[PDB]
Hints:
The PDB classes it as chaperone. Keywords: maripaludis, chaperonin, chaperone. Mm-cpn rls with ATP and AlFx. The structure is cut from a larger assembly and holds three copies of chain A. In chain A, strands 7, 8, 9, 10, 11, 12 and 13 form a seven-stranded mixed beta sheet that branches. Chain A is elongated. In chain A, helix 2 crosses helix 3. Chain A has 16 helices and 19 strands. Chain A is of the alpha+beta class. Chains in contact: A-B, B-C. Strand 9 (242-244) of chain B pairs parallel with strand 9 (244-246) of chain C.
Amino acid sequence: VLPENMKRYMGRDAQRMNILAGRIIAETVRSTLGPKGMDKMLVDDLGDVVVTNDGVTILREMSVEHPAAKMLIEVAKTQEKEVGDGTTTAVVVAGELLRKAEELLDQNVHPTIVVKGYQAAAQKAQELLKTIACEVGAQDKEILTKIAMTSITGKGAEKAKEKLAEIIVEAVSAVVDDEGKVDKDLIKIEKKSGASIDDTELIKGVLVDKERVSAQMPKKVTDAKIALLNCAIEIKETETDAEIRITDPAKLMEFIEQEEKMLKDMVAEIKASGANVLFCQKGIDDLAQHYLAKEGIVAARRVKKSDMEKLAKATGANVIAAIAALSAQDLGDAGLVEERKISGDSMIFVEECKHPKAVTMLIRGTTEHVIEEVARAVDDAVGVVGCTIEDGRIVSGGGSTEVELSMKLREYAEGISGREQLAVRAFADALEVIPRTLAENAGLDAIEILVKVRAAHASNGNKCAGLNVFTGAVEDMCENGVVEPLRVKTQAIQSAAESTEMLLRIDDVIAAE
Amino acid sequence: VLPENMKRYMGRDAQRMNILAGRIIAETVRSTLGPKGMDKMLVDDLGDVVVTNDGVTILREMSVEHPAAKMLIEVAKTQEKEVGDGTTTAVVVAGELLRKAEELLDQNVHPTIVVKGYQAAAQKAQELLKTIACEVGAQDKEILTKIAMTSITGKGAEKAKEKLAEIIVEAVSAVVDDEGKVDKDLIKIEKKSGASIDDTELIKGVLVDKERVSAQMPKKVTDAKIALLNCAIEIKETETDAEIRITDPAKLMEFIEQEEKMLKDMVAEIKASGANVLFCQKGIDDLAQHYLAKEGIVAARRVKKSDMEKLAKATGANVIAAIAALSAQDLGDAGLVEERKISGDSMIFVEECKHPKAVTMLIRGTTEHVIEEVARAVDDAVGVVGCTIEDGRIVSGGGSTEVELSMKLREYAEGISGREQLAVRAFADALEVIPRTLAENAGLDAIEILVKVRAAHASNGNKCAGLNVFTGAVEDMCENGVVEPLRVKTQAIQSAAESTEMLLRIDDVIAAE
Amino acid sequence: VLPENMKRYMGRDAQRMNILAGRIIAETVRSTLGPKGMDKMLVDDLGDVVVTNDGVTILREMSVEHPAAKMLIEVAKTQEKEVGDGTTTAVVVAGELLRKAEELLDQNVHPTIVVKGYQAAAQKAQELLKTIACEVGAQDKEILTKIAMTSITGKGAEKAKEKLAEIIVEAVSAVVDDEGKVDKDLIKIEKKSGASIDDTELIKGVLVDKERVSAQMPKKVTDAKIALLNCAIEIKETETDAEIRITDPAKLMEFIEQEEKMLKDMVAEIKASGANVLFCQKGIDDLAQHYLAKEGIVAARRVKKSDMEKLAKATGANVIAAIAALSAQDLGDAGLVEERKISGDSMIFVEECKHPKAVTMLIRGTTEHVIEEVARAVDDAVGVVGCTIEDGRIVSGGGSTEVELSMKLREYAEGISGREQLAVRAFADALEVIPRTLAENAGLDAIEILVKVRAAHASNGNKCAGLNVFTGAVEDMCENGVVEPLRVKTQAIQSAAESTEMLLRIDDVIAAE
């Protein structure tokens, strides 16, 4: 039926390839997992080299061939959107679930039983998460600083995790306003080499990598009245086709000066609005740039649409199409707009906004690749710090959660019985990959910690356990401020369990040669 | 250092290939395991087609590439020599041990710990076997018939397992003499199509697929005096170079008649010995064949050296080089030597030997391939029936043994502790492959029987358990006569554990392209 | 000057390739080093698979391309002859010396200084060995059992190291006679599957894998008179060209019977000597085999020349060319010669020799590959047990020696000074590879043991230190019976230092494409 040459996997072969696909992805990505995790080095078809530890970046950029591997990628993507961090974690636990699932298929457990047990065990795991979830203050400084901190760790950015935690919890607190909803779009992540990581700083307004179009323009404007134009500041040309037909030597002069007169009048209208700081999405003619400078109006052209929107939200400026439409009521306010050299590069700092709904975080560091990792790192910090405000539940790290779920899911399996219990038993045992892989990357004895952590967890609790990879022994994660948003763990279990079970539900793969 | 093109495996890759090699062999051969096991169909490079269920035959004949797969073959070979049957069983348990071992390597269990745990667990398994070994009569009719029977089952020969069991225990009892030592060389396995399997029968003497060299020779000789010659019955030619030089017309006639006279005298000497049944390893000249017939001496030429030896042991005939050396004291005795047509083919039945140390079992059946399987089947029956006389311990089948060993080795693991315990735990769990694979080939629910058999075994015992694949439920193997020689199980554990551990001790494979 | 296509290395490139050659050999072989060392799996061009841990076997069999790698092989070969064991050790320490030497070349240490420092440091290392050498009884039961034991360990044979140690020290004690000189040729290493390793046993005489040429021959002969013939027992043919020319019908009969008469007379002469056990290097005619059997003479033909020599030394039999030359004074004595089935195979046990100068050790085990490793293992045990009798100095294991030499060679370097000191410093540090690689294969913390062992060694001494890989901690090697012959260590340092320095003295390699 299929074209000669087309390749197909079926039954245990479809499952063999599918398990290997997700298992290989997890096998390669799991080496990034944890504070002591390492980095991957991806080289594009053009030669572009990227160094990262983020599971999503790794999966998005790398060249994947296996269809099942392409499905797991979506799990990491939903993690990126919902929480930001834990992207690797979601893949790893999914891969181990698939590792155990293949054994169950080899154990002659009917495909419908495996997916039944996993659906059941994941439904209980969801309840268990909601049962161990620890209520914290949605905007509590302290717990926010701990959430922010734990995300930062295991990255090059952890060198200043104290400063960076403070920066992020302040940014997300500013832009969220009420309690609440957090939108990552409200916090811009800008990076410019120079200084160190500790010098990274939040600007309560908008920082753009633009410059003032004329050397004559003031270098600093206080009590700034920001205007947002989308049209280009040039001699507007009619929509309907039109041409001028000059037939008098006097008119040759009139029209050339009339062009200059229009553009001058356009500038006069910009000034008439009360605007003195101007961001144009499109270009600005050199003639207009001069007259703008002489009216004491500072301006920047070719402004990114994304920047135009961040300016609107921060300053309260209204995005205006036509210059004629400008008015004082459409202008936004900023305390100070100043052009500064950052690593030599000219950038505009629009700061001290009255009530900014959008803020900009400027990342500093010794090298492009340092600020590159940090810019990625804090994106995730914003994610998880946003999670805690919307969903005021957090849970302890160090693999203590999955240990709680392992114990209760083993008890759950006993209640289930039949052949279905084996699927639940394997699901429970699979959750142990977390403390096990953390230890492998940490260089700790997996067997020792698994005995000591499991026993110590079960007796002492969840708010008094977990593995500390930093000292290489069971400790108190909660006391040590090692906590992550509930969303991280529940979204990991959610996306992983459904996509993992989906892969296990696939019995037939039809792919081109 | 190595020639460009030569392939090498190292570390976990050497282990990956080695595990896959033994695992694939076991994965393909395990479908033969048990009474409900199937057959493989091996086609040689010349086109020769062989159908078998014997692990050894399968491994010897098939074209193996992996070095590790070539090592496991030796395990099956030592099983063939020592017990005959259980050849598949030895491979299967080894493959599962390797399956578990790879997981332990993936579990970051140091290669020296895995091989330590297996060496330890196998040492305990040996003690446990010696502890569950059931003392039976070395020559007890009943237990011998049960040993013989259980070996026969799962083969095409099981159709007459009652007749065949009786045949083998009688053959091995005859040739063993005292208590005792059994040598498979004493029981010839002859096969000739025709009749059915129930018609298979033991001849207390030697049956050879030979005929009387002359039509004039008696077709039956009673109170037979058997002579065994190795030299050819022709005009003996001197060792030193010699030629006759005839120079008289009288001498031309003298020498031609002198050749006939010598050969006639040679026959006269054969007769002089008192011999009347003659087996010559080499050829017999047509002239001698006639004079032999006229002296009432029956004879067969070109007799296989192996047949010449079986004749010596059975009849008590002495193997004589030269005809001149023949005497009455060198002759053996047989009650009757008769030439019979078996499936039309002329065969010689040398039967009713006084005290035969060698007997011949003639296998009957509807087709060449039927008697082919039966001839293989009873070879194994001789093996295991010989085991019970030398080593008067037997054990129950149905996987009950390995269940006993699994439980006690799990308890053993607890005493061991550390990381070494995991290796012992995996070794114990690996022993469960037996009842699990028996069930797969039987089409039984693996999960159900594993719960019911393990619990029922632990409570009721070993002489009151095991799985009966014939009704598809836990039963009493011992009461049902489902027992095998201790040697089967201990030799399986012995060769498998050492070769399995040896494979696990290999960290580096260097193979040509 | 050289043919276009021929490849050449020169200067630091000749050194680069040479270091890599020896370094790669050492890098691959070092994983065999120590009690917890692993095995390599070598596959020949024909498919022949060999599994071994012996450095010599590995190097001899594998396909080496690098000329420098071919030189190191000789180091392992001289170790095999002189001591037997420590073959890997000699290569490993040489590779590390080359590893350090390359750094010194990179450190701009003139090639003549590197080889000067190594020659100097090795000369001191030789003195240091002679200074720590511990005087023991050349034939002391106890220390011999410890030498024998330590060689056995780290191999599959260690399972019965107690029995095997006793066997070897008894064999070498028997054949050595006076004090003394040991020749490995006096101890035959025979192997036959069946039983276990503990069942391995020494026969004070000669065990050959031969059988009695006639079934009529006695199966056991007491107070045996052994004859050793090299000529074949057939109708001797003259050296000068000769042929018989028969021209009478009476002569046709005379010569044929004269051939039988000669061969009969030949046998009569064998009997006349008083011989009743006969080993013929060449063949025996069937006619002679019979007459031998009737004279009560047991015989075996086609006897290996090597066996003929071991028989001469054991029984005191004199190797005789011609049968006519046999006499009572040329016969050897054995208490009993008996034909036994070992794993079914017919073998002849010539035992209870009066004063045997040659003995045979029969190795037992569960499989061919088990007795294969054991046969290799005990060859080395004979080597090292022979070393202790000739050279009555031994030294403690666990890397304690090289630790003593490291400390004193560092002090030596300080006295040397200049740039030459760096070569001596690197030589001293290179000797640390031993405890370091032992630990890697044992899975021990290299850094921890190196601090604790070095300090504990320096304070407590050499007869109270070393690393015990079996408990994974510094212990007392000497008290624990972990000692090896001085020869092992001094021959390792000798061959390694000279061949290592030789490689470092080579600056130019000219090899075919």
